[PDB]
Design a binder for this molecule. Structure first.
Ligand code: ZDC
Ligand code: ZDC
Ligand code: ZDC
Ligand code: ZDC
Ligand code: OXE
Ligand code: CA
Ligand code: CA
Ligand code: CA
Ligand code: CA
Ligand code: CA
Ligand code: CA
Ligand code: CA
Ligand code: CA
Lengths: 11, 114, 114, 114, 114
C-alpha cells in the first residue's frame, strides 16, 4: 500500500 | 467513471464476500441506500476471506463497495456479469499502492440467492 | 458448449470459492490438469461459503469445475472476465433442479493473488 | 442452459450487429417479444459485418438471438456485461461445425443508444 | 486504473468495430504495439458503425483504444470477457460530456476470426 520509497517511507 | 456502484433489484437479498491480497490491512464498506450496511476488515497476502454476509439491497437497490487502507480509498475497478440471463455477479478489484495488481481487496457480490 | 473449463496462466496461484443456494446438498469438485485438487460440500439457501482454497494452475493451467447433488451432475454456466487487463475472474453457476436460478452452487475463481 | 436470450429494459433502443467467420452462410434472427424483428444473412471468413440495425425492445424487453447455417441451428454461447453500472453489452457466439471456435456468427447487442 | 488496453495472444487476427452515440464527432484510434493501425471518425446518435477493420495483434499482442472528441480524450471504461474458454471480446465505452451514458463511442474487439 501507498506511494512509497523502500517499501514504505513516504506514507 | 464511477466504479464499485451497482443497481440491484430493489428490496432483494444478495451475497457480498471480500478477499485480501496485500500487506496492508483492508477495510471494505458495503453501502445500501447510501448507508454502511456491512464492514469487513482483515489482512492477508493469500486471498483469505476477510468477510462474508447476506444483505438486502434496500428501497433503491443501490449498492456501493468502498475499499480503504488506513482510511485512504483504494482505486477501484468493477463490472457486472450476467449468465443465462439470470445469475448476476458484481465484481470489484482494488489497488492500494503502485504495483497495479488490483487484487489488494477483491469483492464479489452475487444474486439472486436462495 | 463446454462450461466450467478455464485456461489459466501456467503455474499461477488462484483462489477458488464456492457458495450454496439450494435445498440440495452441493458437491463442488475442482480439477487441475484433470486431477482432483479440491472438493467442497454443503447445504444452504443463504449463500454459505462451503469452501475456499488457494490452488496452483500447474504446468497446463487447465482448471475445471464440476457440480453435483447426491451424485447427479448439475447443468453449468460459466464465463471469464478481466478488469484493467490484469485482474481475472472465472465464474460458474449451476442448476440442480427446475427453477433455473443457476445459483444452486456458485463458484468464483480469482487471480492473481498476493 | 438457455443462451442468446436477454432481458432489456422495456421500450429501449438497442443496436444489434452480426459478424461472420465461416465458409458457411450464416443466418442471424433477432426476436423481440418472440417475433422476428431483424434477419441478417451473409458469409465471410474475415469477420465482415453481415448486418447492423437499431431495434426497439418493446413492451416486454425480451430479445432472443438465433443462428443457423444451411437450416441447422448453431450452438450458442452468450453473456451480458455491464460497465460503470450504465453501459450494456449482450454478446453471442455460435458454432456451426466441429472446431469449436464459436465465432462462426458473432452477435453484439449494445444499449443504451443516443 | 488504465482502461482501453488489452493484451491479445500474439500474431492473432482480431476485429475492431466502433459505434457512435453522441452529438459530437468521435475519433477512434486503434494502436497495436504502440503504433496507430486504424482510425475511424464520425458523428451519430443512432449507433452508426463509424468503422470496422481486421488487424493482426502482432508480436506484442498489445492493443490500445484511443477515443477523442475534437482532440480531447474521452473517459474510457473497458473489460474483457471470454465465453466457453475460447471466444474473446474486449469492450470499450467512453464518455465525452456530462450525462455519463458512456456510449459516446463504443468499441468492440473480437477474436479469434476465420
Ligand atoms: C430451495 C430450492 O432448492 C432447489 C430445488 C428444490 O426445491 C433449487 O433448484 C432451487 O433453486 C431452490 O434453491
Ligand atoms: C471456415 C470454417 O468453416 C467452418 C466449418 C467447415 O470448415 C467453421 O465452423 C470453422 O470454424 C471455420 O470458420
Ligand atoms: C447527444 C448527446 O451528445 C453528448 C453531449 C452533448 O449533447 C453525449 O455526451 C450525450 O451522451 C448524448 O449522446
Ligand atoms: C502496497 O503498495 C503493497 C501491497 O502489499 C503487497 C504485498 C502486494 O500485495 C501489493 O499488491 C499491495 O499493493
Ligand atoms: C500504506 C501504509 C499503511 C500504514 C503504514 C505505512 C504505509 C506505507
Ligand atoms: Ca496492489
Ligand atoms: Ca496485491
Ligand atoms: Ca435452482
Ligand atoms: Ca437456488
Ligand atoms: Ca466453428
Ligand atoms: Ca469459424
Ligand atoms: Ca455521454
Ligand atoms: Ca451518448
Amino acid at each position: 500500500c501507498x506511494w512509497x520509497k523502500x517499501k514504505x517511507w513516504x506514507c | 467513471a464511477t466504479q464499485g456502484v451497482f443497481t440491484l433489484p430493489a428490496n432483494t437479498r444478495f451475497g457480498v464476500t471480500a478477499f485480501a491480497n496485500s500487506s496492508g490491512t483492508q477495510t471494505v464498506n458495503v453501502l445500501v441506500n447510501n448507508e454502511t450496511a456491512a464492514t469487513f476488515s482483515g489482512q492477508s497476502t493469500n486471498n483469505a476471506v476477510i468477510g462474508t454476509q447476506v444483505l438486502n439491497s434496500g428501497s433503491s437497490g443501490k449498492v456501493q463497495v468502498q475499499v480503504s487502507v488506513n482510511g485512504r480509498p483504494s482505486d477501484l475497478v468493477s463490472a457486472q456479469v450476467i449468465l443465462t440471463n439470470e445469475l448476476n455477479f458484481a465484481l470489484v478489484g482494488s489497488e492500494d499502492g503502485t504495483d497495479n495488481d488490483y487484487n489488494d481487496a477483491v469483492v464479489v457480490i452475487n444474486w439472486p440467492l436462495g
